[PDB]
Amino acid sequence: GAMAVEYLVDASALYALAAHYDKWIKHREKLAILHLTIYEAGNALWKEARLGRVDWAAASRHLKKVMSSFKVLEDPPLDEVMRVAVERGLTFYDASYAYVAESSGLVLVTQDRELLAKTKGAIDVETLLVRLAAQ
Amino acid sequence: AVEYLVDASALYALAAHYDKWIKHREKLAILHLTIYEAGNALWKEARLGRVDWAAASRHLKKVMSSFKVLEDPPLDEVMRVAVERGLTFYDASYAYVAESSGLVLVTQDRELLAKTKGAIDVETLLVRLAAQ
Amino acid sequence: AVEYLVDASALYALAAHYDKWIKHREKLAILHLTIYEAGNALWKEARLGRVDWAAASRHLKKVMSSFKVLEDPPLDEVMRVAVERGLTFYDASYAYVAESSGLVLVTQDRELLAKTKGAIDVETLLVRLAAQ
Amino acid sequence: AMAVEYLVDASALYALAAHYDKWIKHREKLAILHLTIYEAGNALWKEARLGRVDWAAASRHLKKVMSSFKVLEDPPLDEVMRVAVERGLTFYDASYAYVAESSGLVLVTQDRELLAKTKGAIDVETLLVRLAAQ
Ligand SMILES: [Cl-]
Ligand SMILES: [Cl-]
C-alpha cells in the first residue's frame, strides 16, 4: 500500500503548516498524521472560536481541506505507547506521535520543544519547509 | 450491525463489567478518539501512582480491541455541533457521529447525555443488553 | 473601588494596551486563579518554541502586579454555577465572583460572555475606560 | 517563619480528605496554594459531570475540609516560569515545586512526577505516617 510517507505530522505542526499551504502540497503523500491529530487540530480551532473569532465556520472548512490532504496512519497499541509515555516522561498524546514516528521509521515534525528533544529524528516545521523546498 | 457508540467515560465504566457485555461486543463501537482518551485517562492514574500501569494498560488494550471503530467525523460538522450546543470539540464528535450515524450514544457525561438525541448512560446500556 | 473582574483571556489581550488602562488599574481586578491560568498560557508558548518566555514572563509579571486580587469564591457556590450553567469550574469561578460581587466580567470567552450577566469583552472595556 | 511544615497540593488534598480525623489535629502544619482551591474544585466538578449523585453535599464537605488549611501567597509568575521550563513541569505543578522548595516546606503530592522533580517531596502515606509519629 503506497507508503511514500516520510513524516509524521502532529497538531502543533499541522497548524503551522496550514499557513504555508502551497509550500507543501505535491509533497503530501509524504506527510502523515494520526487519527488523534484531527481531533487535536479541531479542538485548537474550537478554542480560537470560543475566545472570539468570527471565523470558525470558515476556518473550520479550511482546516477540513488541509486535513484531507494528509495520510492517516493506523492507531498505535495502547500497550506500547503507555510505555513510551511512562518512560520518556510524555503524555499519552505526545507518546503517541513519538511511538508511531519511531516504530514506523518516520520523521516526526512537531513544534513542541519537549517532543523534538525526546523523539529521535524529530524536526520542526521550519525545517520541514526547507527540506521540501529542496526536492 | 453496530447499535451503540461508547465514549471514553463509558468505556471506562464498562471495562469494569467485561463479562456482562463481551457477548454483545458486535453491537458496540467507538471513535479513534476513544483509544486516546481512554489511554490518556489510564496515563493519569499511572501519573498519580499505582504499580500496574503496564498490567492495567494490557487490560485496557484487551477491552479496547472488543469494539468496532467508526470513521472520523467531518471536522466541519462536529465544529457546528460544538458551537451550537455548547460542547467541546471532543464531546461534539460523539454527539455528531452518534446522531448522524443513527446510533445510541453511551456516555457517563451528564452534559453529553443531555445534549445528544437518545444518549443513555452505562447502567441503562447494561440493562438493555441483559434483555437483548 | 473595583468595577471589573478580568479573566485570563482578557488579561492577555490587555497586556498589549498597558498604556490605555493603568490609569484605571484599581478599577480592575482578577482572581488568584488568573495568575496561574496566565502563567500556564505563557508556558505553552515556551513549550511550542518561544525564545523570550523569560523576558515575556517578566513583562506578564508586571502587567499582573497591576490588578487587585479578590478573595477566592466558596468552592460551594461555584460548583453550583458550573453544574447549572454548564461551565468548567474555573469559568464558573469568574462567573460567580463577577455576579455575586456586582462587577462586570471582562472576558474574551464567547461562552462566558453569554452565561454571565453583564459580561463584556476587551474591546468594550477599552472604549469604556476611554470614556472614563 | 510559621508552623506550616507541609505544602499540600490537589492530588494530596483528595487522598487526605478521607483521613480527616488522622490529620485535622495537625491542620496548623498543613498549607495549600490558592491554586489548590480551584484544582480541587475542578476535580470534584469532573466527578459531578460524570454523574455523582451528591456533587452538592460533596462540594460542601470539600469546602469544610479545605477551610482547615492555611493558604500561602501566590508565587512570582517570574520564578515559577523558570522552574517549569527547566524541570519539564506545567506552570501549575512548577508552582508547588517552587513555593515548597523556596519556603523550605515539604511538598505533599500524590504525583510521581512532582515527587521526583521536587526536593524532599513526599506522598500522602508518608505525611500520614509522619504526623502519626507526632
Ligand atoms: Cl509534561
Ligand atoms: Cl464545557
UniProtKB/Swiss-Prot annotation, chains B, C:
Domain of life: Archaea
Record's protein name: Exonuclease VapC9
Record function comment: Toxic component of a type II toxin-antitoxin (TA) system. Has ribonuclease activity. Has a slow ssDNA exonuclease activity.
Span of domain PINc: 4-112
Gene: vapC9
Lineage: Archaea, Thermoproteota, Thermoprotei, Thermoproteales, Thermoproteaceae
Binding sites annotated in the UniProt record for Mg(2+): D7, D91, D109
Cofactor requirements of the protein: Mg(2+)
Any coiled-coil regions, as ranges: none
